[PDB]
Amino acid sequence: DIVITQDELSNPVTSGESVSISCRSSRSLLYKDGRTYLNWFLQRPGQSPQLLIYLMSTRASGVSDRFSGSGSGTDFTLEISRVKAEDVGVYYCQQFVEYPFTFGSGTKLEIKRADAAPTVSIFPPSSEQLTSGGASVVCFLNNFYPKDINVKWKIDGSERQNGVLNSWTDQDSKDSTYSMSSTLTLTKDEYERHNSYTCEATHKTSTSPIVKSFNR
């Protein structure tokens, strides 16, 4: 069936700039009625896909006039004019000229904003978790930009890698930052063998890591 390819955006876009996103079909999507059967969708973080453009260049009802589609029968462009923070998400094309109405794999738009250092907080295990024999130590690294960040755990001054799980949010639709959580899980018995628990965040906004600790 028809192969749809999308280009990645290599660079983040500052609010107010415009950006073009492209997709390509292995087969022409121009139909015998003279219409070209290509749709564009935006999937904002955590939401269902929203149709922006159908028939290659027709805007869906309610869609901002900042979104416009153009192209030939095989190469298509979505232009986003004067990008706003809320435009962040993944843009998909879909061919609608023959079954199985294939989608491209998406193009993620990232918004460029001013560098922001993470707000770091660390939390000891709760009494409740300790009663069940477990001990998770949690560190939040909130509202930073750009997305690249490193978290290191130290117990009694020794770097600890085992038992660490990390999770990252998508870019925020309002302030264009990212956040991350890191959780170190140990048994209660192992937790109680040590005193000092530390999470260290290294980010481009500083030469020295932001360090947060507590003592059991």
Partner: protein
């Protein structure tokens, strides 16, 4: 207002049939459209599954072989997906949508429903409060949280103060290990408001019919 909404089990065992319902409001499934099922896999690839039109005429993606049936019940304004003999590869978020001849869906996609295909057991989360170690720089802000540990399947929903606290919240994607998920949620409030005023996270896990409230109390 044309709306569509999916419902059905969030967990199905391998080899059994997955069934989902799409309930259409503000529009008759007798108006002339391709009432469509689409799914989005982990990692976000989208796949068109098929449609029903004119009550009884269907078409399906060949990728699904002979495993898919779409039907409808005009009396209930509902159409249905049945996908037989599922495997873990069928784990996805399932959407229903209304397509017209020209590919226009309007705003008419459902919110989506997660279905996990797994032999693992439904398990409700343990919810633990995350309260600051000692004190720090007040007259500014304080970050609290809750740790939602050891549930299956996805999803959970987290709110703070029953949804009254919506600003300054970060709920992180879950991480899976040993057939159990864990996620955390942080909330940041002015330090003048806590501990003076209470902060509670509310955690719902529909798949196990459990909802837990955890008040965050100072250590």
């Amino acid at each position: 207002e044309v709306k569509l909404s999916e419902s059905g089990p969030g967990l199905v065992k391998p080899s059994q049939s997955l069934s989902l319902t799409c309930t259409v409001t503000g529009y008759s499934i007798t108006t002339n459209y391709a009432w469509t099922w689409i799914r989005q896999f982990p990692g976000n690839k989208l796949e068109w599954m098929g449609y029903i039109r004119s009550s009884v005429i269907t078409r399906y993606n060949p990728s699904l072989k002979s495993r898919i049936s779409i039907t409808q019940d005009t009396s209930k304004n509902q159409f249905f997906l049945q996908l037989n003999s599922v495997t873990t590869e069928d784990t996805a978020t399932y959407y229903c949508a209304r397509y017209d001849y020209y590919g226009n869906t309007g705003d008419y996609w459902g919110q989506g429903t997660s279905v996990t295909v797994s032999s693992a057991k439904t398990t409700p989360p343990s919810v633990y409060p995350l309260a600051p170690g000692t004190a720090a720089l007040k007259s500014s802000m304080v970050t609290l949280g809750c740790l939602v540990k050891g549930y299956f399947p996805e999803p959970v929903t987290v709110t703070w103060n029953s949804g009254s606290l919506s600003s300054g919240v970060h709920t992180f994607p879950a991480v899976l290990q040993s057939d159990l998920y864990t996620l955390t949620s942080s909330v940041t409030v002015p330090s003048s408001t806590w501990p003076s005023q209470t902060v509670t996270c509310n955690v719902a896990h529909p798949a196990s019919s459990t909802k837990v409230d955890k008040k965050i109390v100072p250590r």
